[PDB]
Write a protein that holds these residues in place. Sequence first.
Motif, short mmCIF file in Angstrom:
data_model
loop_
_atom_site.label_atom_id
_atom_site.label_comp_id
_atom_site.label_asym_id
_atom_site.label_seq_id
_atom_site.Cartn_x
_atom_site.Cartn_y
_atom_site.Cartn_z
N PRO A 1 11.17 -12.57 43.31
CA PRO A 1 10.13 -13.57 43.44
C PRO A 1 10.68 -14.91 42.99
N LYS B 1 3.10 -12.86 35.00
CA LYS B 1 3.50 -11.60 34.39
C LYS B 1 3.68 -11.83 32.89
N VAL C 1 1.61 -15.46 40.61
CA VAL C 1 1.15 -14.51 39.64
C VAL C 1 1.75 -14.87 38.29
N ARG D 1 -0.45 1.30 46.99
CA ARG D 1 -1.77 0.91 47.41
C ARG D 1 -1.67 0.79 48.92
O1 LIG Z 1 4.02 -11.01 43.28
C1 LIG Z 1 3.81 -9.93 42.69
C2 LIG Z 1 2.68 -9.06 43.09
O2 LIG Z 1 1.89 -9.48 44.11
C3 LIG Z 1 2.47 -7.78 42.35
C4 LIG Z 1 1.40 -6.78 42.63
C5 LIG Z 1 0.22 -7.09 43.34
C6 LIG Z 1 -0.75 -6.12 43.59
C7 LIG Z 1 -0.57 -4.82 43.15
O3 LIG Z 1 -1.52 -3.89 43.41
C8 LIG Z 1 0.68 -4.47 42.42
O4 LIG Z 1 0.93 -3.21 41.97
C9 LIG Z 1 1.62 -5.47 42.19
O5 LIG Z 1 3.34 -7.45 41.32
C10 LIG Z 1 4.39 -8.23 40.90
C11 LIG Z 1 5.19 -7.83 39.85
C12 LIG Z 1 6.26 -8.60 39.41
O6 LIG Z 1 7.02 -8.16 38.37
C13 LIG Z 1 6.57 -9.81 40.01
C14 LIG Z 1 5.81 -10.29 41.07
O7 LIG Z 1 6.12 -11.46 41.65
C15 LIG Z 1 4.67 -9.51 41.57
#
Ligand SMILES: O=c1c(O)c(-c2ccc(O)c(O)c2)oc2cc(O)cc(O)c12
Length: 237
Positions: free
Chosen positions: A47, A11, A9, A118
């Motif tokens: 992560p 960010k 991902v 979720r």
């Molecule tokens: O790997 C990550 C991840 O899958 C999600 C995520 C996925 C789906 C959702 O519906 C949600 O709310 C969050 O957030 C993150 C936030 C971070 O700061 C760091 C991450 O590594 C992730």
Amino acid sequence: ILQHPDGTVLKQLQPPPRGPRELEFYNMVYAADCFDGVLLELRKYLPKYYGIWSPPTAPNDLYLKLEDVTHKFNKPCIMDVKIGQKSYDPFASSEKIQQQVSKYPLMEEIGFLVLGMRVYHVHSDSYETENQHYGRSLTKETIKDGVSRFFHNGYCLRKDAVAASIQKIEKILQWFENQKQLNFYASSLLFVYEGSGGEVEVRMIDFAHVFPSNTIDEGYVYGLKHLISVLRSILDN
Ligand SMILES: O=c1c(O)c(-c2ccc(O)c(O)c2)oc2cc(O)cc(O)c12
């Protein structure tokens, strides 16, 4: 959060000073030349960090490239929980303290706040989502049932996921019990389980307010312990 083509991902950095501080934190923890045992152990609970990333034509647009902690799941059920007694940091102004405490004035009492969840439901083949106002509406009287909702699929309360979450949190608690160099404000735990036995991910995220310290992070410890206690009580349901 953007889902880069790799099981990762992106960010996007929050505006300054928050984004820059989060970049700095990931850089400190994952420094190639780091041999601080505290920071090497911490990596297990974050992560995986792949460095700063920007689009090829947009060096202005700053992201953190991070492990997608949901990648190994088919139908991930995800809950984000903010941890600690204070969501404002040690250099917050009076206005900022008030801004943060007013977002959820029960933070000192409960020590955690559900930011969202979720949940995949088997019976309907669909997701129920709860937003920021869900956790902010929870009180001492309703926090147990509020957390419980995350573990309700179609047919049962997922006590396997509850017990695994407690076991994973306990390792994080142990890391906090054995460090006096970082204090974490407005940081979160991301919980993931399989919605499609006992398989959970719990990772620490959100590091725009991590500060150097010389004490135990007592508010974080309070929150983790209270969260463990709530989860434990859910095992009696
Ligand atoms: O790997 C990550 C991840 O899958 C999600 C995520 C996925 C789906 C959702 O519906 C949600 O709310 C969050 O957030 C993150 C936030 C971070 O700061 C760091 C991450 O590594 C992730």
